[PDB]
Structure formats: C-alpha cells, structure tokens
Design a binder for this molecule. Structure first.
Ligand SMILES: O=C(O)[C@@]1(O)C[C@@H](O)[C@@H](O)[C@@H]([C@H](O)CO)O1
Lengths: 121, 112
C-alpha cells in the first residue's frame, strides 16, 4: 500500500523559513521521482519541482516561481522527501502536496493529504 | 513557458448526463520518440488531494471507471465523462509533463 504523508505546516511570517516533510512507504522510494505541488486556497494546482530517482542521479528541478528560494532534497535510507523553503512570501501560502512522479507514466500517480501553510503577521 | 488553457472554467450538470471539457496547449505535447502525448488529467474532489485519472492523453489509470475517457493529441485534448455520477463533482486539471510539469487552470464540475 502506497503512503505519502506530509507534515510541518502552520502559521509563519514572510521572509522566514519552513521545513516541509513527506514520509513515504509501500513502494521502492529510489525507483521514482518525487514532486512538490501546491494549491493556494481557492486556486489551481502548482508544480514546484521534483527530485529524480536512482538511475537519473537524484538531481532536482524547479519551477521559475520558486527557483532559488525553495530547495528539494530526499533521504533514500528513510525514504523521506523534503521541501526546504526560504522567504515565505505572502503568495507562498497554500496546501503543499508531495507526490510520486517519474518517467514511467510521466505523471504523479500518488499524492499525499497535504499540509496547510498560512502566513500571518 | 507552456500554457495550458482549460475550457470552460466551470460547468454544472445533472447526474447521468455526458460532459466534455477542453485542454488547450501552448506547445505541442507530442513526443516523436515514443510517440506519446505528455499530458495527464487530474481529478480533485472538494477538500481532498488530487488523483491521477489519465496519462499519455488517453491511457486510463488503474481503478479509474470506464466512463472517464481522454482523447486528443498535439495541442488539443479533451476529457469526456459519459454518465456523470455524484462522485464526479470536483475540479479537473490537465497537466503537461512534456517539459518538467505545468498544470492548467482547471475545469470545475458541478452536479445539480
Ligand atoms: O525531467 C526529467 O528527467 C524527465 O525525464 C521527466 C519526464 O517526465 C519527461 O518530461 C522528460 C522530458 O520529456 C525530456 O526527456 O524529462
């Protein structure tokens, strides 16, 4: 059974930092990519980037929207995905979904329940 | 900077009916190598996490009911739901995975 559990959500103030976590299971972690998609309350989904798998070299990619500020890393041993965020701008706020990606179906076939981020002064 | 425009923005319908919705692309999403259209449709019920419905334009994901049918290629794609059930109420996103990933604005489905 595939499981993706995100965590580390809550109130923060802009410019600060926040570390989002995403535990996995039920599949060979290193066999797949791992993407981060976010959805601002009342808005559409946004792909932030992924981290490739073992065969590719666990290299990372980012959308122009978050490139530089956010950085993605993984922990193959424990099979845990991470999103290191920097300068939590007012439009950074939203529910953050980690997902299972790759070049097999070229899609995110498994998603987590997400973790909410709210930026309040 | 691939841009995916979905039409319409929203659409309400009664259960059991047949609906279509459009996904329009900026660049061709067709790969001449494996001859695959790098586009996927995603279902997201209100307050829940998104779910893969279809990939490679027409390939239905495992478990997804037969009434969900995806079609099109290049820049033009559509999602067809033959006999909309109550469970179907949700926002539908098309996504290009031709170069990294990009989601459309989404098409919201209502059931009255
Ligand atoms: O970024 C990748 O490594 C990846 O292989 C992801 C695939 O889904 C696919 O988009 C691919 C491009 O099509 C280039 O081959 O890039």
């Amino acid at each position: 059974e595939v499981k993706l559990v995100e965590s580390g959500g809550g109130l923060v103030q802009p410019g600060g930092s926040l570390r989002l976590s995403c535990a996995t299971s039920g599949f060979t972690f290193t066999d797949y990519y791992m993407s981060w998609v976010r959805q601002p309350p009342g808005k559409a989904l946004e792909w932030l980037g992924f981290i490739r798998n073992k065969a590719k070299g666990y290299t990372v990619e980012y959308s122009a929207s978050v490139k530089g500020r956010f950085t993605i890393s993984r922990d193959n041993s424990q099979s845990i995905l991470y999103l290191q965020m920097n300068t939590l701008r007012a439009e950074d706020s939203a529910t953050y979904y980690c997902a299972r990606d790759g070049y097999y179906v070229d899609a995110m076939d498994y998603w987590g329940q997400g973790t909410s981020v709210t930026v309040s002064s | 900077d691939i841009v995916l425009t979905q039409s319409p923005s929203s659409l309400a319908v009664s259960a059991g009916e047949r609906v279509t919705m459009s996904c329009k692309s900026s660049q061709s999403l067709f790969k001449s190598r494996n001859q695959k259209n790098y586009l996927a449709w995603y279902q997201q019920k209100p307050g829940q996490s998104p779910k893969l419905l279809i990939y490679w334009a027409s390939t239905r994901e495992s478990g997804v009911p037969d009434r969900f049918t995806g079609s099109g290629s290049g820049t033009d794609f559509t999602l067809t739901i033959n006999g909309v059930q109550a469970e179907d109420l949700a926002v539908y996103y098309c996504k290009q995975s031709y170069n990294l990933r990009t989601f459309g604005g989404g098409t919201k489905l209502e059931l009255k």
